[PDB]
């Protein structure tokens, strides 16, 4: 009668995916949901705020693990999570995205014969030296069910020999989340007011990929280029804390003061900032998709994206950070462009399709 | 001057590492660092192999073992990462498909250190086996894949792994059997010491978790061997977990009914295998080694990875569901031989492997 579905989350974007899935599982006939918070993101603005603003139940467990190496965090999450599984003995383990928490989750589970579904499965950058590419490859090959958000993602899984009956194209749960919480963003966020921004009167930026922040010359290119764009149109930049650290350590802190630099914001503010921006500059997966949701033109500061359909639809554009001025002009150019009318990522009911396929 | 750090953990890994490290010591500039995870620690599981196979002492003993999958794998992952940051090697070599293997590749790969997997591409197609998980994730984490068979090649291709990263080299355990044969022949007195002639017994090993962690399955086996014993003597070097399980379930008595030994060394094991009438096992290595010595095998599992042994009729599966049938299967196969065919290479898999590591750039 009752199925127990246990969710493993560690990072900001995982909390947001999980919020959408929880909603559907909460009001499901006979589903008990258990939520593990691995402790990977711990601060109030990377964690707590999302549980409160997206009405996510308090986690049944907080493993309190973070701030170490790949080896440390993965190893200790692996042991801790296994401990919890051995206690809760759930039917399904759900993991999301592609951090060390995603992998430790799946790997703890498969060795206990516990079914694993990967929510957001089959994305590839095809650069195997990326920790997130390894994480999503090893996760997919260890899961039993694979919830693909796009046709590309499906063909990626088939090509690595994963059979069709274990793959379900269900669209993207972060589109679910945008729809269902959009109205709540409307009535609660007052961030345009707090920062004194007129709608479509600024650009929005996020930057945190390690290939971008650990390399001094790439990070300088990016912060120079954003400061230049500020002169022409204000830049709002909720700065990931790792990015903040790396900028401070390489002595690029002045560029941040030269734009509208923020600590990280909750999802409601973010929606409200994403919605009312003229253009979005990012290296985030979630935010590139989100720009497209609101038909705001996007520039992705990478050599590739896993969300290729956004490039084909002309709503997103690649701009590797080789040159500061080159990147600035690319950003200012793409502001007066737009993509085609097209539906991606589904109807808003990816989460409900997931719940279905799990009974 | 290239550094190659090996990660080993258990009996079959030391046998594989021995064959390979013999070639790496002979190679100009090439320094080795050997890491022992501590997964096997009893002397007849570990130190004996180091002594008889002429393997230098490990540069590190992490002394992790005897916990859960999570505990072992997790603690190994952190520990091996710590070493790798110390030694910053150019290659990490991992072997087979223990939890040690996986902790190895996972440590290495997130540090952007190239990983090579010795014995790559094997698949049982049973994810209930912790070792099916281990080789799948290892192979997907590796930059070189030293497949031992054409099956293992094809397996890797179908999981969308590029042809350039896959080399078929044969099996280093064949290099081992070949290199150490004279020394076991000359130094093993195991036959004398038991009181056995050639062709006059049956040799048996059993340690698959899926056999030992289920009582009525283990009962099936122990009894099946006890019956066989009454007809042809059964020599049975017992794995420690197998013994401790036999005790946990109260099947102890069954081991009296055959020639139960503690675990033997490779030298003694070679002679036992060489001079047996039939081998029966749930072991990876022993299956192939039976074929090496042209001795019929029975494999007490639902599947094997070594499917070529079945097709050549050197091997036969018999899942343990019924004491009586398992015994009869065994006694029938005792009368069989497979076809003459050459598997697993020319005995120089280690040389090919060494070659490929040096010339990889
Ligand atoms: C490149 C890469 O691997 N990326 C993976 C990565 O996610 P990601 O890169 O998007 O990191 P991230 O940008 O912090 O989150 C965005 C969210 O934060 C919100 N967001 C952002 C900033 C902010 O101040 N406030 C806020 O609410 C935004 O509104 C938005 O909803 O980890 C994810 C995970 O494991 O689940 C994977 O799904 C991703 N994989 C992919 C393929 O996109
Ligand atoms: C089924 C499975 O996953 N198996 C994997 C597993 O090895 P395995 O099943 O063969 O365990 P094992 O039987 O302890 O050792 C045999 C050796 O011990 C010697 N041996 C055996 C008994 C004895 O008393 N004395 C002795 O010297 C024998 O002469 C023989 O040389 O770990 C291996 C590893 O990670 O490298 C993987 O390569 C294997 N994968 C495969 C696919 O064979
Ligand atoms: O030298 C050794 C190695 C293993 N074990 C036993 O084997 C169990 C599990 O061994 P492991 O998980 O390493 O797997 P194996 O490949 O030996 O089955 C441990 O809890 C020990 O009780 C032992 O007694 N001595």
Author numbering:
A (entry chain A): 1 to 359
B (entry chain B): 2 to 362
From the article:
The final step in the pathway is catalyzed by a 2-epimerase, which utilizes UDP-2,3-diacetamido-2,3-dideoxy-d-glucuronic acid as its substrate. The focus of this investigation is on the ORF WP_011172736, which we demonstrate encodes for a 2-epimerase. We have also demonstrated that the T. thermophilus enzyme is allosterically regulated by UDP-GlcNAc. Whereas the sugar 2-epimerases that function on UDP-GlcNAc have been the focus of past biochemical and structural analyses, this is the first detailed investigation of a 2-epimerase that specifically utilizes UDP-2,3-diacetamido-2,3-dideoxy-d-glucuronic acid as its substrate.
